[PDB]
């Protein structure tokens, strides 16, 4: 029986029959296989064609699972993400901010944007979801959504007021010191792109000025470029609070 | 979802996935009706050997016909009376 | 066709199956006798006795015995 | 009289099962129902000055 | 709910002579019998959840009692001998032929329904 | 078209008939909180229905 | 999978709203120094995250005890909290809930000759919270058992309907004792959950993570 | 199910100028919210039958255990002392006042719903 | 039917049928609130006397304060120790 | 009004009450000990013993005792 198991192993338990079981529920199976590290381009081509007649009827949890799965596999199928962005645009009231921040980060990984998608995502975060949902988001996810709107030039000041609520000493403090640097430097470029300087930009600038040794000389120049621009917009002087 | 996939999965296994065709047993076997007779006794022989391999060091409650499993032949596994085999197993268990 | 109407109703039990399992359980719990390997004792004996002495070895067989007749508990050593 | 039970762990685990069911039934069945009914009234009462002002500025009917 | 033939008579009589022939497919659909459409899929019924958990609880209770038996390894291998025939019955039994053999057991399904003929109920 | 316009408003909100058309502008103000309270509580109570 | 429909304004919804808002009122959130706006809104949500759910826990313990206490006043029924392991098992569970909340703040490390005496006053809250519930459900029912026996000795000995006024006066004192046990059943569920808000609310303190940077004027 | 205001707008616009005023009560009823009529009376639910038989089984189980007790006659007369207060609570408690006292416990029922006003949403 | 009548029946008894008005207890009693206090103790006194009359020849488990029910005064009903009262009852039971 | 809609739904239990009565019963039947006045015995003792000797008098109190302490069965007379 040393070879009867090995004969069964080379023909039955193959990656191709792992795919043939995975064809029934692609948003479930591609999400959990890629979570286990199975990020293979040849299988995710077969995932993209199996789910394409089913995308328009997918739920918001299935769309978010499918979009995160194709981000971890790093596979871009433009006809798949067209139907994915047509599902988000048709059901934007049903989507959540926690789900849309994962969908936007996939749409920002490979540059894929529509003007209807940017409007329906901004309407979903600002009006269809709770206004304190960016507080629960995590600042690394909100800075990705800010960069995605800055790169497409889409100015939505109602969205920018909602996303800026998530930046604080709480949410930036939960990040790694290297990860806080990339979050601060990408949120300050997006706030300077639209010319929007909310009151919660004091936490983004203050996260850079309380620890400037992580930042370079040219980075502290563009931080204090935003700091003087927010000082004119908010009408005051920047001061660091010390507890006591 | 969890039930709708499992119905679609087992339907593919019951009908579409056949190991009689994928392994090419038409060369070795005559009929599909004699393959399922060999798959029947093959299922019994595996389930006998798996249930014994799941716990091999046991004294058998079934009567062995004067035969011993491995190189034991005097241990608690081969003892006829079970009251003696319980005392011999307790000495073997504390060492191992 | 009426096929999609009959797929609407799920699995259902037979119509009086609760009365069948009520009658079968009541024949097994209302026996009017102690329960298969136990004996009723006085309240004075039950309170004075530890749990390990209150159990008997025959009523606790080993789940996968290496020797036929292994018991899980040893019971009272007082004979 | 009855002072100590037959098992102290059984009476404590009964109190743990009953209180965890009430904790589950409150957080899952009662408080989602309570807060749907409370915060519909509470959000309307907290917005109605700003809601009616925002709606007054929007419609061109006047 | 009124009957559909009187709705046919009422809708055909009320229609114009000009739009009689065009509206006949509309009167046909209004008197068509209702066939309920395929509803949304639900995974398990409540009684289906009791039946599967109750059969799983019964299997685990009987496997625990078989394993504590005196001839315990004979009991668990008798479950192998019994489950092997359930696999062989899925392979051997002609499930379409058995379905039509059972269909011929009842006289209601062994023949087609012979009743009212067309010429006896022609209405002129 | 004028009758069809007012038929839609009085089917949805029939309590608009308690305010005369010539006195509607005399209730308005720049802020909503400054709108005249002559018709506020009567409109809110007729809108609740006949019960 | 299909949840039931609820009528708005139902009496159990209005009762459980006022009950939950009462135990939430016992540990109110602290007013921050800064005005609450979009700058201070994440610090308010984070301060709410660091607060324990004492409002939810106390109305869990209020409803599970006032239901158990009133079972002792229903006919053919006794109170579960009249048993020792049930009532004291709830009181040690509250004390262990307050201790685990207090230990999770510092390090999960347990904090000259003064602190052994303050420890005895703290670990007596484990006993006294559940025992006060247990003795109140026991001693009121035990006194009811003795006085019903002494009230039964009169019509047993002095005729059933022979003489009324002596067995009338003891059946009035017996009837006022069951009404007193109705008052104790509601009060001891309230005292338990008041003290649970007090004990858990001692460790319900975290520092406000306010703005580290500000644009003043 | 479409919304009823767009059905009002569609039905008022489609009607003639002659029969606009007569058909306004028909458009009013087509947009009226559904209030389901009183269905046929059914005596007991299945779960109501389990609850009453289960409470009767519990009462008979506890009365059988109280009667076998040592102080058995004290246990059965404590059921008289306990059931007497359930009768007195039906007599003493102002059940309308307690209903409105509980109604004032929740802020959703202690006040009327203050929201959208008429002048802010007037459509001209 | 069986449930719809019983709801209509008890509604008439709970509200419409009042024995405080049909018996005219306003002459004897001051208030309706003091009638329900007397109906309370009256319910207790009946339920005490009915539970004792449902089985009168019993030895009391409650302590009688040195008193005897009827003309017994030496029988098993009046015995202090219950082990003696059980033996005296068995002689009384075979005769009666 | 919606009053006739709310009279359509009958009595319903609380939503997870089956899990509450499952947990309470499983704490009373899965005790891991003999059941309150009984003692586990050997299979040899259980088979040889009559039902009347297998019962104990304390576990069968009289339903309405004329004397406090009357038992329904007398048990084994062998001491
Ligand atoms: C080779 C590698 C293996 C790959 C692994 C995946 C392949 C599947 C392998 C086997 C999985 C078995 C799962 C079967 C149970 C789940 C299927 C199911 O119940 O779904 C539907 C299908 O139901 C059935 O499958 C019933 C079929 C039973 C017929 C008997 C078949 C042969 C049985 C042999 C006897 C075995 C005895 C034990 C042997 C050890 C019914 O539910 P539904 O909601 O989807 O339907 C809609 C109505 N609500
Ligand atoms: C005969 C030739 C050989 C054939 C193959 C071998 C036979 C054995 C094979 C085993 C398969 C048996 C049937 C498979 C059932 C499970 C798969 C399935 O289809 O699940 C359905 C239901 O399956 C079951 O639940 C059946 C389980 C029956 C076991 C009974 C055990 C009883 C334990 C509980 C008793 C409690 C009684 C309470 C009384 C109120 C799903 O139901 P649904 O709600 O989605 O709607 C579909 C209805 N058409
Ligand atoms: C002595 C102490 C015993 C204690 C042990 C526990 C037993 C407790 C007894 C109460 C438990 C519940 C009793 C169940 C009977 C009433 C329920 C019923 O009437 O049956 C069905 C209600 O619907 C009916 O069919 C009513 C018809 C009556 C049921 C059975 C009639 C009697 C059958 C017995 C055989 C009679 C012939 C011989 C009589 C000598 C519901 O059954 P199902 O859940 O399986 O079906 C629902 C599936 N969707
Ligand atoms: C001429 C027409 C007569 C019509 C009557 C039909 C009777 C047969 C129909 C089928 C029903 C059978 C159920 C009756 C069982 C009676 C058993 C019995 O009397 O003895 C019990 C007496 O035991 C007890 O004292 C405890 C009380 C037990 C009550 C039994 C309840 C179960 C009833 C089953 C439900 C029937 C309906 C369910 C669906 C058919 C227990 O038997 P045992 O040998 O284990 O113990 C004897 C004493 N040591
Ligand atoms: C949508 C479905 C509705 C179904 C309809 C049911 C209607 C009947 C209500 C069910 C009865 C529930 C019994 C609960 C009794 C609680 C008593 C209470 O709420 O206390 C007072 C609360 O009212 C107060 O404002 C406080 C007055 C002091 C009373 C002290 C209350 C403590 C009582 C605790 C209960 C102790 C005994 C426990 C008995 C089970 C009520 O008095 P009031 O309405 O006359 O006074 C209001 C001013 N007019
Ligand atoms: C003076 C001579 C007596 C004449 C005899 C007839 C008069 C009736 C006497 C008493 C009969 C009691 C029967 C009550 C139970 C049956 C009523 C019932 O349940 O029907 C409805 C009414 O429900 C109720 O009656 C509940 C009322 C309970 C409130 C509490 C009242 C006072 C309780 C006092 C405590 C007693 C404690 C024990 C004392 C010994 C609900 O069911 P439905 O289907 O008809 O409703 C439609 C929804 N499907
Ligand atoms: C507080 C002040 C004093 C007030 C008066 C004294 C309080 C005690 C009075 C006793 C009356 C209690 C309520 C009366 C209930 C019975 C009358 C009744 O109305 O019956 C209805 C239902 O009554 C009941 O069934 C309630 C019984 C509750 C007892 C609970 C015992 C639990 C035993 C079973 C547990 C099994 C759990 C299974 C989990 C799946 C009929 O239901 P329906 O289907 O026709 O629809 C009407 C629904 N609104
Ligand atoms: C170890 C051996 C034990 C053997 C003893 C017997 C126990 C057998 C175990 C299986 C019996 C059945 C288990 C019941 C749980 C599953 C049913 C369920 O999910 O609940 C409801 C299904 O609907 C739900 O609500 C689902 C939600 C889950 C139920 C409860 C969740 C867990 C609550 C426990 C507290 C959790 C917090 C603490 C955890 C450590 C149905 O309940 P209902 O009949 O009372 O309501 C229907 C009335 N119309
Ligand atoms: C840090 C977070 C941890 C989360 C865990 C939460 C735990 C508490 C939540 C409430 C659930 C309590 C249920 C657990 C009971 C454990 C009792 C135990 O371990 O001992 C049992 C061990 O007994 C056994 O060996 C038999 C197996 C018993 C299993 C118990 C099953 C009941 C589980 C209750 C269901 C919980 C969910 C229901 C709704 C809340 C029986 O106790 P005993 O004193 O009577 O016997 C001791 C040995 N002589
Ligand atoms: C529970 C496990 C299974 C146990 C089952 C035991 C009972 C089995 C009953 C079926 C056996 C009888 O088998 C029965 O044969 C008769 C002929 O004799 C068939 O009767 C008919 O079948 C078809 C009709 O469509 C035609 O070929 C023909 O008119 C006739 O042969 C039945 O359709 C078949 O069902
Ligand atoms: C040990 C001896 C007993 C063995 C076990 C007995 C099993 C009993 C179940 C088998 C019964 C099946 O018996 C079945 O009877 C039905 C009655 O509707 C017959 O039904 C059919 O008969 C004939 C011919 O097939 C058709 O023309 C007819 O339309 C139809 O009614 C089937 O032909 C027969 O197959
Ligand atoms: C031993 C001490 C403890 C005893 C037991 C404690 C019992 C706890 C339950 C009682 C709680 C009831 O507490 C209830 O709180 C609600 C909160 O919605 C208050 O609710 C109401 O307050 C005020 C004034 O009444 C209204 O203007 C307001 O609209 C409404 O919210 C009620 O005034 C109060 O009655
Ligand atoms: C007719 C008059 C009606 C008066 C109604 C208001 C009184 C109601 C009485 C119910 C009980 C009052 O409840 C009371 O709540 C306060 C806070 O609110 C608790 O107060 C507690 O708060 C926190 C909790 O750790 C501690 O910081 C504090 O030191 C402690 O006193 C009391 O311990 C409790 O007694
Ligand atoms: C389970 C058995 C019962 C145990 C119940 C124990 C908790 C009881 C909670 C109710 C007690 C609090 O009682 C509460 O009193 C407050 C005032 O203080 C009332 O509050 C208000 O009532 C009404 C509002 O409609 C007005 O008169 C007024 O604005 C105010 O007094 C609440 O409406 C009442 O519910
Ligand atoms: Zn067998
Ligand atoms: Zn008692």
Automatic annotation (TrEMBL), chain A:
Domain of life, per lineage: Eukaryota
Protein name (Swiss-Prot/TrEMBL): Mitochondrial F1F0 ATP synthase associated 32 kDa protein
Species assigned in the record: Polytomella sp. Pringsheim 198.80
UniProtKB/TrEMBL annotation, chain D:
Domain of life: Eukaryota
Name the UniProt record assigns to this protein: Mitochondrial F1F0 ATP synthase associated 14 kDa protein
TrEMBL record, chains E, H:
Organism superkingdom: Eukaryota
Name of this protein: Mitochondrial ATP synthase subunit ASA6
Region of the whole protein represented: 28 to 151 of 151
TrEMBL record, chain G:
Keyword Transport among UniProt keywords: yes
Residues holding Zn(2+) 3: 141, 145
Subcellular location field: Membrane
Binding positions for Zn(2+) 4 per the UniProt entry: 145
Annotated positions binding Zn(2+) 2: 141
Residues passing through the membrane, by range: 54-72, 84-103, 112-135, 142-161
Keyword Ubl conjugation: no
Known role: Mitochondrial membrane ATP synthase (F(1)F(0) ATP synthase or Complex V) produces ATP from ADP in the presence of a proton gradient across the membrane which is generated by electron transport complexes of the respiratory chain. F-type ATPases consist of two structural domains, F(1) - containing the extramembraneous catalytic core and F(0) - containing the membrane proton channel, linked together by a central stalk and a peripheral stalk. During catalysis, ATP synthesis in the catalytic domain of F(1) is coupled via a rotary mechanism of the central stalk subunits to proton translocation.
Protein name: F-ATPase protein 6
Organism: Polytomella sp. Pringsheim 198.80
Name of the coding gene: atp6
């Amino acid at each position: 029986s040393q070879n009867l198991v090995s004969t069964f192993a080379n023909k039955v338990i193959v990656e191709e029959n792992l795919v043939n079981v995975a064809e029934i529920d692609v948003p479930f199976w591609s999400y959990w296989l890629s979570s286990a590290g199975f990020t293979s381009k040849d299988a995710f081509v077969k995932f993209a064609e199996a789910v394409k007649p089913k995308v328009a009827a997918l739920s918001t949890s299935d769309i978010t699972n499918l979009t995160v799965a194709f981000k971890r596999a790093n596979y871009y199928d433009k006809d798949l993400f067209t139907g994915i962005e047509a599902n988000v645009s048709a059901n934007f009231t049903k989507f959540e901010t926690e789900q849309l921040l994962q969908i936007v980060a996939t749409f920002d990984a490979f540059n894929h944007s529509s003007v209807a998608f940017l409007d329906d995502v901004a309407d979903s975060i600002t009006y269809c979801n709770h206004y304190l949902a960016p507080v629960r988001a995590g600042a690394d996810e909100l800075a990705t959504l800010l960069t995605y709107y800055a790169k497409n030039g889409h100015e939505r000041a109602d969205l920018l007021a909602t996303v800026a609520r998530g930046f604080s000493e709480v949410s930036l403090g939960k990040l790694s010191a290297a990860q806080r640097k990339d979050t601060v430097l990408s949120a300050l470029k997006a706030f300077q792109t639209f010319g929007f300087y909310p009151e919660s930009i004091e936490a983004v600038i203050g996260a850079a000025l309380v620890s400037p040794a992580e930042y370079s000389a040219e980075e502290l120049k563009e931080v204090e470029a935003v700091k003087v621009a927010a000082e004119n917009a908010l009408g005051g002087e920047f001061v660091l609070i010390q507890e006591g | 979802a969890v039930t709708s996939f499992l119905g679609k999965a087992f339907e593919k296994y019951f009908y579409d996935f056949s190991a009689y065709e994928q392994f090419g047993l038409n060369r070795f076997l005559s009929s599909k009706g004699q393959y399922v007779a060999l798959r029947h006794v093959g299922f019994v022989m595996v389930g006998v050997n798996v249930l014994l391999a799941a716990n091999f060091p046991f004294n058998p409650p079934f009567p062995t016909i004067g035969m011993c499993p491995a190189g034991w032949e005097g241990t608690w596994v081969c003892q006829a009376d079970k009251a003696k085999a319980l005392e011999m197993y307790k000495e073997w268990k504390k060492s191992n | 066709s009426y096929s999609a109407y009959f797929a609407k109703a799920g699995f259902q039990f037979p119509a009086g199956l609760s009365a069948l399992v009520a009658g079968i359980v009541a024949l097994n719990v209302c026996t009017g006798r102690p329960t298969k390997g136990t004996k009723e004792i006085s309240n004075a004996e039950y309170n004075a006795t530890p749990i390990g002495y209150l159990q008997s070895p025959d009523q606790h067989p080993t789940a996968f015995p290496k020797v036929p007749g292994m018991k899980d508990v040893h019971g009272s050593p007082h004979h | 009289m009855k002072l100590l039970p037959e098992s102290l762990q059984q009476e404590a685990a009964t109190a743990a099962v009953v209180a965890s069911w009430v904790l589950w039934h409150l957080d899952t069945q009662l408080l989602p129902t309570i807060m749907r009914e409370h915060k519909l009234h509470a959000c309307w009462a907290a917005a109605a000055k700003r809601y009616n002002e925002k709606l007054f500025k929007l419609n061109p009917s006047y | 709910e009124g009957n559909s033939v009187a709705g046919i008579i009422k809708s055909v009589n009320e229609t114009s002579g000009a739009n009689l022939l065009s509206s006949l497919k509309t009167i046909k659909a209004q008197a068509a019998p209702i066939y309920p459409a395929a509803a949304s899929s639900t995974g398990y019924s409540t009684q289906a959840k009791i039946a599967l958990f109750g059969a799983l609880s019964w299997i685990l209770y009987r496997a625990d009692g078989q394993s504590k038996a005196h001839e315990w390894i004979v009991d668990l291998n008798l479950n192998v001998l019994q489950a092997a025939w359930l696999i062989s019955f899925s392979s051997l039994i002609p499930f379409r032929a058995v379905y039509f053999a059972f269909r011929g057991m009842a006289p209601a399904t062994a023949s087609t329904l012979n009743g009212l003929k067309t010429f006896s109920s022609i209405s002129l | 078209r004028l009758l069809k316009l007012w038929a839609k408003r009085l089917l949805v909100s029939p309590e608009l008939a308690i305010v005369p058309l010539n006195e509607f502008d005399a209730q308005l103000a720049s802020k909503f909180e400054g709108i005249s309270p002559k018709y506020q509580e009567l409109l809110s109570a007729v809108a609740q229905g006949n019960k | 999978s299909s949840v039931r429909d609820v009528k708005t304004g139902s009496l159990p919804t209005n009762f459980l709203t006022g009950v939950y808002r009462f135990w939430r009122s016992q540990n109110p959130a602290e007013k921050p120094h800064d005005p609450v706006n979009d700058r201070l809104l994440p610090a308010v949500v984070d301060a709410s995250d660091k607060r324990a759910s004492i409002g939810t826990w106390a109305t869990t313990f209020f409803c599970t005890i006032i239901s158990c206490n009133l079972l002792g006043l229903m006919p053919f029924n006794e109170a579960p909290t009249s048993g020792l392991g049930f009532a004291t098992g709830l009181g040690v569970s509250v004390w262990a809930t307050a201790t685990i909340l207090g230990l999770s703040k510092t390090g999960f490390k347990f904090p000259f000759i003064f602190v052994p005496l303050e420890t005895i006053s703290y670990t007596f809250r484990a006993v006294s919270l559940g025992v006060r519930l247990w003795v109140n459900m026991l001693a009121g029912h035990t006194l009811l058992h003795i006085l019903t026996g002494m009230a039964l000795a009169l019509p047993f000995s002095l005729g059933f309907f022979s003489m009324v006024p002596a067995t009338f006066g003891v059946c009035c004192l017996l009837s006022a004792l069951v009404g007193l046990e109705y008052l104790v059943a509601v009060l001891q569920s309230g005292v338990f959950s008041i003290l649970s808000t007090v004990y858990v609310g001692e460790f319900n303190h975290d520092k406000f993570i306010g703005p580290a940077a500000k644009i003043v004027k």
